[PDB]
Symmetry: D2
Subunit: 255 residues, 4 copies
């Protein structure tokens, strides 16, 4: 089963600039028959890590092959070094992901039902995934952080090439207890009885963030929030993310 | 002002291969608001000439700027050296254009009303435009051949690099009186009382097809088919088609 | 080390039209220092199968990841339904591959040494690979047919979607003894003592072309031409070609 | 004149992320002769304005047609909302432009002589053009600011969609006397007997930056810096920049 690979570049009203976006749209027989109603596809929002962009999942994995097999549309935006935040000094990249979600669901044949919408991503994108899962729980039925950063201070303190902590968080001395802290977002969601998407958290056992993942699922267990955790051999690279996204895609479309 | 520039590559069931396609999709406020119904856009099917492809209108004109002013969606397929024919030895490129039409109208917010759908193209694409206008009149309200080939044997006998006459028409010596002949298609459309689209025919006065164009509008006049004809200085190049397509787009979107 | 992914569209003098080409160019520190001459890279010409195009290796495999690991440049042209032949009724796609080879070696930092240049491909592209291996042996030190068609009459008689046998071979009754026959090309290469590139032949055991590959390597054995043959589980799909190409790239650069 | 349109995406060591870049590469015979030495092309570094990106010159002008006509290679990078600065809280985008210059001169057949290299851009890109002209005068023989901002404080105090002045300049209350201020860069270039490329300054008379351009040219004569200023009807839009780059390209190439 094949599909369409789509590169879109549009002027975003939220971030004030042209920006590239890539979309995988699997083929359906209704797309070629003008007398049939388009039946909308299940949709995955997929978020890249630091130093990656909207092209890197396509280049370094076989994701389109996996998505085609499962009739899953995949949306891959670009957010730079933003950590998926409305940046103190930068762009409103949190709001941007929400605009991308609304835009593709308006212009493409994508289901708008919560049960048909998922979010996933790796490293900074796993951090982004858990932030959206805990603040936009009504938009996604399932969320898949891969090799995620859950202790936000480890992301902000990283000395990554050309990376600016202050652009994201400004003057802030710590992120604990703020909108940047997944532990705070999680306590907030439980306290307000928000829907939390079904969680499949994956991380390779040789990954440097492996302890970070253990600490977070340990906290989830202690506050009685369900999840699936899958580890096994793997490091912090696209060889691991290629295999994990294949497993994640199978899990999201099947129950 | 702003819009989306879209590159699509999908596996076409009609031509049995992956093929690239370009789409210009102007922005509409309904595209960014999940609570409003999408307002479908007026749509232009735009056909390239021989040796061009799906990228060349973008590269050699400012078509996206003009389309954006008038909120006109533009579909630009690729058909190789086919002359928009179901080839004797090749691909079913006539059927391909009908497939592209149904496909983009299924997956994008494009109006399906006849009054909102137009077709245009230059040289071999003007030849294609008049063929679809005279055989698919129920799909297009307006048609704009630019520097078109109306006497088909000029194209079939043209001595262009790597161009194969026989791939298109096979062993046929002449194209007159066949599906490849716009005069025949025209006589059959009038004889069968088919709806024929509103016609704007343009061609520069220094173009080698100028006299070819004069012959065709003279025949249109003798069989009581209306048209508007625009000439003036210009040759067979993108300096002319950049100008001509800007004027054509204003004519299409305005009653 | 991540490198560059490059999409090129240029007007080909050989096939008389614009055509898309994709290139993977791994990073070399000399690319960032204007005062040095570029260290020319090893280069692989990679040929797609029928119904694929210049984007399908990127989309359905992780080839860029594998190429980056081995600092291997990769050239991926598009040749439609041509079977890499100068078509009886169509385009001169055999000559086209030679033009692509000359073009990318002129404009990119690619080694022009025979020992640094390789060719590979699957199905129709493995058939193309073996023809180029046996007719351009001075240009390639290694050749890797994957799931190749070696008995050409099976591809010509294949009834694939919109596939035209006469477009390639015209009025020929059979392909035995012609330029289209790899067995003839092999006998001719041995008879004239042409250099034959180092051969790695791969085919999945569940592939319908498996017996066709066994027949060909048996003939190679009987005329004392060396080769390495790799089978194992796998069918005729990109799941198989994703890791045949990963093994092939390791084999090509490590001699 | 036909040519190559090239999209490149590479992981930049300077800005720590994958980034897209577009390149226009006109044809020369030597690109198709394996036996001739490639003749290096004249090269234009072309800088977009605020809210544009690496695709917008190709989409909203006919620049490739003009460049092909004069055998001019054109490099179009993306620098987001950076104003071509090494940002206080962001990316090292000044250094990035220098990396791009070195990179494309290593991997493409581009002349490294000063007399063959030019720089141009509009609005924020005209501001960028004058900054590189006055700090990298040895890399460029000619520079063309189009509708530029010379009084840098107009750009920093601008109230544009999602635009962050503090990302660029930090706490600075004024830009005067700093690297962001073109008037200081000009006095320092004159003071240090630094080479100033030949200057063609263009601005439409209805452009809101027109008085800002008049002020700069009045200062240029006042201190003996030669220039040509070209005005005429035009506003701050791509309709004007389409003229102006067409005229600008003819001026730089012909000598
Ligand atoms: C993930 O996107 N991050 C970017 C570089 C590699 C992993 C890294 C990270 C490491 C440690 C803490 C947070 C982020
Ligand atoms: C138009 O598509 N054609 C391609 C090459 C230039 C003009 C040419 C044509 C010339 C004369 C008759 C038919 C086509
Ligand atoms: C390979 O490119 N061919 C295209 C379709 C799938 C395999 C097919 C082929 C099958 C049998 C004989 C020849 C070709
Ligand atoms: C140019 O790129 N700038 C972005 C918005 C429109 C013009 C604008 C600018 C205006 C005035 C001063 C500096 C920049």
């Amino acid at each position: 089963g094949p599909g369409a690979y789509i590169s879109l570049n549009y002027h975003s009203p939220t971030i004030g600039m042209h920006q590239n976006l890539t979309v995988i749209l699997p083929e359906d027989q209704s797309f070629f028959n003008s007398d049939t109603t388009v039946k909308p596809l299940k949709t995955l929002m997929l978020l890249h890590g630091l130093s990656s962009d909207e092209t890197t999942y396509m280049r370094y994995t076989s994701i389109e092959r996996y998505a085609n097999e499962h009739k899953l549309a995949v949306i891959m935006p670009n957010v730079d070094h933003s950590a998926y935040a409305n940046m103190a000094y930068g762009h409103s990249y949190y709001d941007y992901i929400l605009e991308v979600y609304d835009y593709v669901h308006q212009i493409f044949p994508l289901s708008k039902k919560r049960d048909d919408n998922f979010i996933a991503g790796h490293s900074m994108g796993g951090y982004g995934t858990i932030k959206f899962a805990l603040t936009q729980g009504d938009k996604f039925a399932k969320a898949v952080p891969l090799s995620a950063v859950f202790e936000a201070q480890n992301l902000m303190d990283l000395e990554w090439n050309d990376f600016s902590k202050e652009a994201i968080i400004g003057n802030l001395s710590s992120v604990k207890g703020t909108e940047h802290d997944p532990y705070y977002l999680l306590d907030k969601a439980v306290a307000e009885d928000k829907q939390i998407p079904k969680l499949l958290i994956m991380c390779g056992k040789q990954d440097f963030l492996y302890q970070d993942n253990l600490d977070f699922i340990d906290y989830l267990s202690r506050i009685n929030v369900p999840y699936q955790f899958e580890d096994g051999p793997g490091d912090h690279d696209y060889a691991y993310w290629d295999q994990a996204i294949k497993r994640a895609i199978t899990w999201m479309v099947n129950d």
